[PDB]
Amino acid sequence: RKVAYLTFDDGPGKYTAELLNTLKQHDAKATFFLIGANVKEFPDLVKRENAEGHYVGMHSMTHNFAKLYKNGEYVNEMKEDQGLIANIIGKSPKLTRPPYGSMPGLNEGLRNKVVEGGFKVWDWTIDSLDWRYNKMPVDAAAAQIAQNVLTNATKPQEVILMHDIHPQSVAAVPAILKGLKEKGYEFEAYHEESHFPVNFWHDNRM
Amino acid sequence: RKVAYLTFDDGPGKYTAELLNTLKQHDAKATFFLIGANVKEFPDLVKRENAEGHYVGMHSMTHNFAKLYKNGEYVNEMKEDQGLIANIIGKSPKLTRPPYGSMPGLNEGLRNKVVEGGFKVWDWTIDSLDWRYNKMPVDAAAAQIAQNVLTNATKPQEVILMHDIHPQSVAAVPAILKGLKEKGYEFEAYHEESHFPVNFWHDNRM
Amino acid sequence: RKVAYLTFDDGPGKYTAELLNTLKQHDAKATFFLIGANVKEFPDLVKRENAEGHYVGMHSMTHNFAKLYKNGEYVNEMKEDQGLIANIIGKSPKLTRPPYGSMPGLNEGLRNKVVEGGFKVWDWTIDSLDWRYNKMPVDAAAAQIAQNVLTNATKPQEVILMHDIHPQSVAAVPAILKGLKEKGYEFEAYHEESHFPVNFWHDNRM
Amino acid sequence: RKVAYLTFDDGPGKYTAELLNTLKQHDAKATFFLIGANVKEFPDLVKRENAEGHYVGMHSMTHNFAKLYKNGEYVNEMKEDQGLIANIIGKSPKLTRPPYGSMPGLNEGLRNKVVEGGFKVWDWTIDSLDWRYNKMPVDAAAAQIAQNVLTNATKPQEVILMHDIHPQSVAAVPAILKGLKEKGYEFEAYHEESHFPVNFWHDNRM
Ligand SMILES: N=C(N)NCCC[C@H](N)C(=O)NO
Ligand SMILES: [Zn+2]
Ligand SMILES: [Zn+2]
Numbered sequence: 001r002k003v004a005y006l007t008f009d010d011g012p013g014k015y016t017a018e019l020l021n022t023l024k025q026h027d028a029k030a031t032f033f034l035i036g037a038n039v040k041e042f043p044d045l046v047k048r049e050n051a052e053g054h055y056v057g058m059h060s061m062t063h064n065f066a067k068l069y070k071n072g073e074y075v076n077e078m079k080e081d082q083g084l085i086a087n088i089i090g091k092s093p094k095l096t097r098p099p100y101g102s103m104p105g106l107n108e109g110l111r112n113k114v115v116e117g118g119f120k121v122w123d124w125t126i127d128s129l130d131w132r133y134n135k136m137p138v139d140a141a142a143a144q145i146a147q148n149v150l151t152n153a154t155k156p157q158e159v160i161l162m163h164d165i166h167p168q169s170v171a172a173v174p175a176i177l178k179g180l181k182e183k184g185y186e187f188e189a190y191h192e193e194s195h196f197p198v199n200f201w202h203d204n205r206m
Numbered sequence: 207r208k209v210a211y212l213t214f215d216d217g218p219g220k221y222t223a224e225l226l227n228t229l230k231q232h233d234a235k236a237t238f239f240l241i242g243a244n245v246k247e248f249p250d251l252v253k254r255e256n257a258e259g260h261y262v263g264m265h266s267m268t269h270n271f272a273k274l275y276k277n278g279e280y281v282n283e284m285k286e287d288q289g290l291i292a293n294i295i296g297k298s299p300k301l302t303r304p305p306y307g308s309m310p311g312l313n314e315g316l317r318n319k320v321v322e323g324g325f326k327v328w329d330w331t332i333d334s335l336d337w338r339y340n341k342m343p344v345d346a347a348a349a350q351i352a353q354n355v356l357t358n359a360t361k362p363q364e365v366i367l368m369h370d371i372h373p374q375s376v377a378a379v380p381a382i383l384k385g386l387k388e389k390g391y392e393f394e395a396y397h398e399e400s401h402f403p404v405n406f407w408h409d410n411r412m
Numbered sequence: 413r414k415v416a417y418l419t420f421d422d423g424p425g426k427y428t429a430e431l432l433n434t435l436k437q438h439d440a441k442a443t444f445f446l447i448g449a450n451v452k453e454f455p456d457l458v459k460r461e462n463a464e465g466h467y468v469g470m471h472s473m474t475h476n477f478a479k480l481y482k483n484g485e486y487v488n489e490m491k492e493d494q495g496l497i498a499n500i501i502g503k504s505p506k507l508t509r510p511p512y513g514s515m516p517g518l519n520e521g522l523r524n525k526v527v528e529g530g531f532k533v534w535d536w537t538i539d540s541l542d543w544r545y546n547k548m549p550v551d552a553a554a555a556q557i558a559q560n561v562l563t564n565a566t567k568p569q570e571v572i573l574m575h576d577i578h579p580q581s582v583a584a585v586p587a588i589l590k591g592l593k594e595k596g597y598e599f600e601a602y603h604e605e606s607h608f609p610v611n612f613w614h615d616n617r618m
Numbered sequence: 619r620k621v622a623y624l625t626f627d628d629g630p631g632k633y634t635a636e637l638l639n640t641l642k643q644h645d646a647k648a649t650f651f652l653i654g655a656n657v658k659e660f661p662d663l664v665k666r667e668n669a670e671g672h673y674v675g676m677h678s679m680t681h682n683f684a685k686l687y688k689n690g691e692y693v694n695e696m697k698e699d700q701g702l703i704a705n706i707i708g709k710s711p712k713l714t715r716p717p718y719g720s721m722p723g724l725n726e727g728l729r730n731k732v733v734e735g736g737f738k739v740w741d742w743t744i745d746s747l748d749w750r751y752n753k754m755p756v757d758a759a760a761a762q763i764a765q766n767v768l769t770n771a772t773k774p775q776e777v778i779l780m781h782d783i784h785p786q787s788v789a790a791v792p793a794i795l796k797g798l799k800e801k802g803y804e805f806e807a808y809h810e811e812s813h814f815p816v817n818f819w820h821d822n823r824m
């Protein structure tokens with residue numbers, strides 16, 4: 001079975017509800033990796049993401065490279081971001097998404113602390129590259145991002161990276177949902193029991 | 207449609223002429239990010255890079271993290287570097303490659319300055335790790351450096367980070383050239399007219 | 413009659429148990445040079461190395477060059493390390509493995525004191541370089557590290573230097589085991605009564 | 619095609635005239651790498667070595683790892699040793715043999731200085747392991763030593779590392795000298811305009 005894991009970073013944002021509506025019409029499940037401050041400011045959308053069948057994961061508190069990796073705060077920020085989400089959805093997620101991917105920031109020491117604290121790490125297999133088209137005419141941008149994604153969809157499992165804080169990304173998800181559904185894909189959320197490694201370190205403990 | 211951008215950093219140096227011959231024999235173009243100290247010491251090598259169809263960009267004066275980022279000399283140092291390079295080749299190139307990468311050093315202050323100065327910032331999407339392989343037989347090191355590069359070229363555009371100031375790096379270039387070619391890359395150089403963003407801050411202004 | 417002596421340094425550590433299993437699966441015996449702080453923290457791992465047919469040697473307390481050599485605490489530290497290990501496994505090992513190798517730390521005075529104290533000193537005849545491969549996917553590093561050891565085993569007795577305190581290192585050992593055994597090596601531990609000299613000073617009193 | 623390049627280090631010494639007699643007795647030609655202070659002390663042996671058709675090359679002034687490599691004095695000591703030898707044999711040898719081998723002592727920087735100062739660098743392809751048997755019965759010691767050597771002789775050219783300051787090494791030579799004539803080998807000395815690379819770095823500028 002060819003599965004497509006849509007993943008969404010740095011949320012929630014002002015386009016998130018738009019996106020949740022779009023995904024529901026297509027009976028598509030997804031994963032969100034939320035930043036701490038956005039959880040505080042959008043508790044509703046967070047509750048809604050869970051309620052509508054999507055996995056809710058963490059993406060830290062600061063999204064600051066020096067704190068997370070150089071100063072080794074990764075696991076602490078994931079844990080605090082875990083609390084905020086637990087307070088809303090009533091369960092403590094295990095799946096983290098490292099800001100800026102895990103390579104090279106998540107060294108051998110921190111990778112131990114992630115395993116030792118119960119967390120999994122998921123990077124991705126596809127960069128939609130949606131940030132390139134920021135502040136550009138949404139329509140044209142989005143269809144380009146769909147190209148970025150659709151034409152790299154090759155292997156049975158695919159973990160796609162998108163940012164639902166950007167309009168062109170959210171706008172792209174329509175056209176990505178059609179073309180992937182074509183090539184035999186299914187759009188599921190990440191399931192914690194069904195975990196399989198997807199990380200730049202090929203580190204199978206996460 | 208696939209294009210690989212070999213980029214060589216910290217040069218020019220005593221191996222740089224050898225690399226220039228290898229590039230020319232294979233009809234391949236690359237990009238060089240130079241430390242001004244070497245611009246001065248090897249001005250003929252700078253002049254030849256530009257003359258053989260390669261891009262000549264800046265990589266600062268001091269290559270000192272503290273001066274560049276903590277003290278905020280990045281844009282200064284890149285313009286000094288720019289001036290020196292112009293005197294030799296007649297162009298004031300706009301592309302900068304930050305020492306130690308942009309993340310975490312190029313903060314938002316400097317990033318604004320970069321844009322207000324009309325400069326451009328390239329990081330990389332493939333790290334050859336070439337300079338680390340310096341405690342082994344050069345040919346064996348070059349094999350492992352090619353292997354790194356060859357097995358990470360997946361995207362239609364790869365910005366491969368190397369350093370022309372180490373023997374194992376230049377020795378690695380032929381295997382690299384041959385491999386990517388079988389995978390379908392061309393080895394164009396950077397063109398300023400065709401700039402597409404490549405940093406770690408996902409800042410598509412630079 | 414060819415014999416590979418796998419040696420692991422700076423342990424025990426969080427991957428030592430996994431490595432201990434993997435040795436067991438292949439009936440291979442090895443040698444562990446331990447740091448005193450680690451000996452104190454993982455006492456049961458020490459016991460398990462010993463109880464499984466491995467030689468348990470010393471690698472100082474501080475792994476601090478200036479304290480060991482410029483200050484001459486080498487024999488002191490290896491003696492305290494010996495004391496700590498004996499309390500666990502019942503025997504006072506004699507063999508030490510110098511942090512940073514013996515050249516040039518183990519000066520003549522210290523080499524004399526080594527011999528006066530009944531200690532033996534081993535450096536190695538093959539550097540895996542394993543610990544340098546900590547910025548790449550762990551499988552990939554492990555394959556390069558295997559390649560290193562395999563392509564350098566040519567002498568009837570080879571002492572391979574590794575570190576069991578790194579994931580890529582422990583991941584390299586299976587491919588190292590298979591390979592050397594293709595080349596007809598068997599994997600013994602160090603044996604006190606069968607001591608032969610292996611050091612950079614060519615001092616056959618050690 | 620058969621060639622065996624016997625090389626002897628750290629000379630001249632007490633047994634060098636014996637060795638020189640042994641080689642002459644077998645029409646064998648060899649290579650000596652001389653330490654500076656031994657050249658000062660044994661001018662006749664140095665003179666005699668050149669006069670009888672063997673190559674005379676340098677092996678440094680101090681034979682000191684930290685001065686040569688860490689403090690970067692290698693080339694200076696080789697040039698100084700070179701002067702001493704020129705003052706006796708009326709030419710300046712190009713071939714140096716690094717104390718302790720070139721790996722990892724001779725880094726990329728020092729390998730440039732050696733290239734630039736006009737010097738070549740020969741390691742070896744066979745370690746006699748002669749130093750193991752020091753202060754042991756010269757008879758048995760030598761026989762073992764011929765064995766280590768003869769055993770690993772299989773490639774068209776061999777560069778054997780021996781030490782003519784040791785009695786067992788010298789005594790071993792008769793047994794080696796036609797252990798190798800049968801296998802085919804002929805015993806030539808090194809000649810500069812016939813130079814081919816034999817170095818642990820596989821650096822072919824050397
Ligand atoms: N100490 C270091 N080299 N830092 C690691 C990254 C260096 C960066 N690729 C660079 O400066 N390239 O020129
Ligand atoms: Zn993010
Ligand atoms: Zn640099």
Ligand SMILES: [Zn+2]
Nearest residue numbers: 421422511512
């Ligand atoms: Zn160590």
Ligand SMILES: [Zn+2]
Nearest residue numbers: 627628717718
């Ligand atoms: Zn020597």
